Design a protein around this ligand. Sequence first.
Ligand SMILES: N#Cc1ccc(C(=O)Nc2ccc3c(c2)CNC3)cc1Cl
Lengths: 39, 157
Amino acid sequence: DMYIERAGDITWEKDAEVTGNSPRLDVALDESGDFSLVE
Amino acid sequence: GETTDGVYRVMTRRLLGSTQVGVGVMQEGVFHTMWHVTKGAALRSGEGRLDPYWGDVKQDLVSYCGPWKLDAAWDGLSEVQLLAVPPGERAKNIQTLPGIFKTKDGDIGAVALDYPAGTSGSPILDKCGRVIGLYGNGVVIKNGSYVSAITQGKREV
Ligand SMILES: N#Cc1ccc(C(=O)Nc2ccc3c(c2)CNC3)cc1Cl
């Protein structure tokens, strides 16, 4: 059996750690809900 | 049991110890998570039981106790925050500028942040704190890293 536990409020944090890039990717989505890269 | 709005961990006592299989959002008495986290199975919140209400394997979404409530959308310009809830670690906001997944059916925002798979279901937020989607479904790029889509459901009526 799976169970849930509260981990916090859903709030925006000012001055949070800013990381990660913004890649534009050509993707395909199949019937199983799985993405794949199109090339 | 606990139905207060907020972010929750999805745990299981089936494997060794207590293992985190994912994360979810409680909003308006509805628990929202990714389909691959629970596989549509029932959830427990203390003594209470949460039964699935709506689900779809292709969208990779599932709701509990009621219809999908989250309808906020990424504006296509602004930075967003992944409120990442990693296994055994505290909830942490990570700001990033999302990229784009270009598909045959339209474009979808995408966050390029890598986390343990048990982080799937963590909400992505806009500057107002509104949930614009869930993190956990995307693609593996050349360097072995992950780029998740900003997966949002549809609110009915
Ligand atoms: N960082 C990272 C990272 C790496 C992998 C995954 C993951 O495997 N997700 C997933 C699993 C099964 C299914 C789907 C997605 C949709 N269809 C079934 C999640 C994350 Cl967050």
